[PDB]
Paper text:
We selected the mild GOF mutants hPIEZO1-A1988V and hPIEZO1-E756del, familiar in African populations with a slightly longer inactivation time, and the more severe R2456H mutant with a much longer inactivation time. The E756del mutation is located at the THU4 and THU5 linker, the A1988V mutation is located at the THU9 linker, and the R2456H mutation is located at the IH of the pore module. At the same time, the channelopathy mutants A1988V, E756del, and R2456H present a slow inactivation rate with half inactivation time of 13.4±3.8 ms, 18.5±4.1 ms, and 23.2±2.9 ms, respectively. We then tried and obtained almost twice as many hPIEZO1-A1988V images as the wild type but only achieved a 3.7 Å resolution cryo-EM density map. Yet, the resulting overall structure is similar to the wild type. Based on these results, these three hPIEZO1 channelopathy GOF mutants may be structurally less stable than wild type. However, in the mild GOF hPIEZO1-A1988V, which has a slower inactivation rate compared to wild-type hPIEZO1, the acyl chains of the pore lipid are retracted from the central hydrophobic pore to the side of the IH, although the hydrophilic phosphate group heads still interact with R2456. Consistently, the slower inactivating hPIEZO1-A1988V mutant has the same hydrophobic acyl chain tails retracted from the hydrophobic pore region, implying that the pore lipids are involved in the fast inactivation of hPIEZO1. Mild channelopathy mutants or mPIEZO1 show the pore lipids retracted from the pore and thus exhibit a slow inactivation pattern.
Numbering used by the authors:
A (entry chain B): 2132 to 2277
B (entry chain A): 1693 to 1747, 1779 to 1803, 1940 to 1980, 2001 to 2050, 2060 to 2180
C (entry chain B): 2425 to 2521
D (entry chain C): 2425 to 2473
E (entry chain A): 2474 to 2521
F (entry chain A): 1408 to 1423
The structure:
Amino acid sequence: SLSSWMCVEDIYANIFIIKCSRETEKKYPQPKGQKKKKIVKYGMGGLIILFLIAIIWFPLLFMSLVRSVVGVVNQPIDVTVTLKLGGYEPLFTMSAQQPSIIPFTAQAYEELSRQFDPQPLAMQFISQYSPEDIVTAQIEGSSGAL
Amino acid sequence: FIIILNHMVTASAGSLVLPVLVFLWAMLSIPRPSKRFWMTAIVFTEIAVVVKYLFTDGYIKYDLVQLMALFFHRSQLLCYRPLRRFFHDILHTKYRAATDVYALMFLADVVDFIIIIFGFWPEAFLVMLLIQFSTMVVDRALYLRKTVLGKLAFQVALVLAIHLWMFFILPNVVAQLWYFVKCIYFALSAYQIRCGYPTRILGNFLTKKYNHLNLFLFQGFRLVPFLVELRAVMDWVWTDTTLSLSSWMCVEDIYANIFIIKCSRETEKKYPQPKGQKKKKIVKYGMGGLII
Amino acid sequence: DKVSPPSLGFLAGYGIMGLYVSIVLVIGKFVRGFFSEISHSIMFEELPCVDRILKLCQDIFLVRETRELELEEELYAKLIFLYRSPETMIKWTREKE
Amino acid sequence: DKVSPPSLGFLAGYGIMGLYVSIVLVIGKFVRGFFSEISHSIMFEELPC
Amino acid sequence: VDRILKLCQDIFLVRETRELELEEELYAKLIFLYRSPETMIKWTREKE
Amino acid sequence: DHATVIHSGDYFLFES
Ligand SMILES: CCCCCCCC/C=C\CCCCCCCC(=O)O[C@@H](COC(=O)CCCCCCCCCCCCCCCCC)COP(=O)(O)OCCN
Ligand SMILES: CCCCCCCC/C=C\CCCCCCCC(=O)O[C@@H](COC(=O)CCCCCCCCCCCCCCCCC)COP(=O)(O)OCCN
C-alpha cells in the first residue's frame, strides 16, 4: 500500500546513512582512548552557542535599531490671525506667510533664554525646542482685508 | 560594606579608588589584609575629607562613618619586585583549604541578568545584556578547566572595567542594585582565587539529594528556554572526553531521566499508598479541574 | 512640535513585545526536540554492521524491477519482523569478524 | 497623478515575502513528521492478532 | 533505577581523573543496555 | 581503535 511503501523507503534512508558513517570510520580510524581534538569541539560547540544568543538578543537589537530615527521640523506655511468682535465681521484678518514667518536665529534663541532665565519652568520649556522649531510670525498690524 | 556603600551614594571618582583596592589587594591577600591596607584606607579617607572641605550641604557624613569604622577595626586588630611576590603567594601558597563556590557565583550573575532585563528603563541595555551573558560563559570555562591564574586575570580585568564603565561612560535604583549584586560576585570570586579549586568539580548541583524540592527545581531549570542545551555543549568543549557530541548528549539524557525516576521512586517509599485504595477526590478534582 | 514618519513602524507596540516572547518559546521547544528523547531511538540508530539489512532492502528493489511480485511480499515480511523484534536485530546486525 | 486605495493591502511588503517563506518551512517539518521516523513504531503498530 | 545510576556516575568519575580509556568501555555498557530491551528488564528489577 | 571499543558490548558484561 502506501503506508507500507513508505516504511520500506524510510528503513532504506536510515540504513544508508549509518552505512556511510561506518565507512568513514574505517578509512580514518581513531585510536583507543584519544580525546576529541579541541578544534573540533570549539568549532561545533561554538556555532551552537552563538546561534542561541542570536535567537534571543539579536531580534531585540534589530527592533531597537529601527527605533533610532528622527523627527521633521514642520514649520507653519501660513499663520492666519483674526480679531473678531462678537457675531460681527472680523475687525482684523492677517495671513503671515513664508517670509513673515522667520525661524529663530541662535541669537534670538539666546535672547529668549536670557529673558526667561529667572523662570526655571520657562527654561525647562524653551530647552525642549530647537531654534528651527521656534518661529516668529511677524503678523502685519494693518488688516490685510478691508 | 561601608567602603562600597560610600561609592553608591557619592558616586564620584575619588570614592572609586578604595572599592577597587578592596577587591584587588585586600580580598586577594592570603593571610590577612596587612597593616598597609588599613593604613592606606585611613589616610585616603582623611585626605578626601580635607579636600572636599577646602572646596553643597551634604559632603562629609558618610566619610565620618567610614573613618570611624576603620579605626574600630584597628582597635580589635590590636587587642588580639613586591608586586611579583604578592602574586606569587596567591598563585602558589600552602594555606589553601579548597572550596567550590561556583553554584553561588552563578546565582549572583542570574540575579543581575534579571535586574538588567526587568528594569530596562535602548543600546545601553542591549550592550549590557550581552556583556553579562559573555562573562557567564567565560566563568564556566575557567571552572571546568580549573585555572586559578585565569580567574585572577578575569577578576582584575572585570573589576577595573565595571568600575570605569558604570562610573564614567554610562552616566537610579536599578543601577545601584546591579552594582551591589556585582559586588557580591567579586567577593565570592576572590574567595575562590584564595582558596583554590577542589578535586571533584564535575557533576550537577540539584542532583545530589533525591527529595521533592530537588525534583521541582530540576524540572524547572529544564523549562527555561536554552539553558539545558547550552550547558551541555559548553561542558563538552571544555571537559576532556573521547566521545563526540552526539554521544555526549546521549549520556546526558539518560542521566536526566534516570534521576527523575529515582526521585519518584523515593517519594513512594517514604509515603506509601495501600493496595487497592482509590485516588482521593481532592487530587482528582484539582489536577483535572485545572486542565479542563 | 516635530512630526514623525517611520518606515519600519510595523515593529511597534507591546503586542510586538509579546510576539517576541512567544517566538522564543516555540523555537525553544523545537530545539528541545533534538536534546530530549534521543535515548528512545538507540535501538534503531546504533547498529554495528548495517550490511545484511542493505541486502534485503536492495533485493526488494530488484524484485520490483523484474516484476516477480510474489517475492516482494515475502521479503517485506522479513524486513517487518526484524523491526518488530529488538533481539533479532542484535543478531543480524553484529560485526562478523 | 492617480491615487490608490487598496482593500486587502495587509498582504504587502517584503516582510510578507519573508513570512511566506517561514510558513513553508514550518509546514515542511510537519509533513516530514509523517514520513520520517515511522520505523520506530513498528513494534507497537504492526501487531498480527 | 539504581544500577543504571551507578554506571552514569562512574562515567563521570573517570572523566575527572582523566582515565579516558575507561570512559569508552563504560559507554559501551550504557549503549548496550538501551539497545536490548530485555537486558534492561534484568538490570532494572527490584532486588528483594 | 576507538570505534571498535565503543561498539563492542555484549550480554556478558550485564551478567551477575
Ligand atoms: C474500490 C474500493 C477498494 C478498497 C477501498 C478502501 C481501501 C483503502 C482505504 C483507504 C482509501 C480510501 C480512504 C481515503 C482516505 C485515505 C486515508 C484513510 O485510509 O482513511 C483513514 C485512515 O484509516 C485507515 O487506514 C482505514 C483504511 C482506509 C484506507 C486504507 C489505505 C491503506 C491502509 C493502511 C494505511 C492507513 C491509512 C493510510 C492512508 C493515508 C496515508 C497518508 C483516515 O486517516 P488519515 O490517514 O486521514 O489520518 C490523518 C489525520 N491527520
Ligand atoms: C580535521 C577533520 C577531522 C574530522 C572532520 C569530520 C569529522 C566530524 C564531521 C562533522 C563535523 C564537520 C561538519 C559540520 C556540520 C556538523 C553536522 C554534521 O556532522 O554534518 C551532517 C550530519 O551528518 C554526519 O553526522 C556526518 C559526520 C560529519 C560530522 C560528524 C560529527 C559527529 C558524528 C556523529 C553525529 C552526527 C552529526 C552530529 C553533528 C551535529 C549535531 C547537532 C549534517 O547533519 P546536521 O546535524 O546538520 O542535520 C540537522 C538538520 N536539521
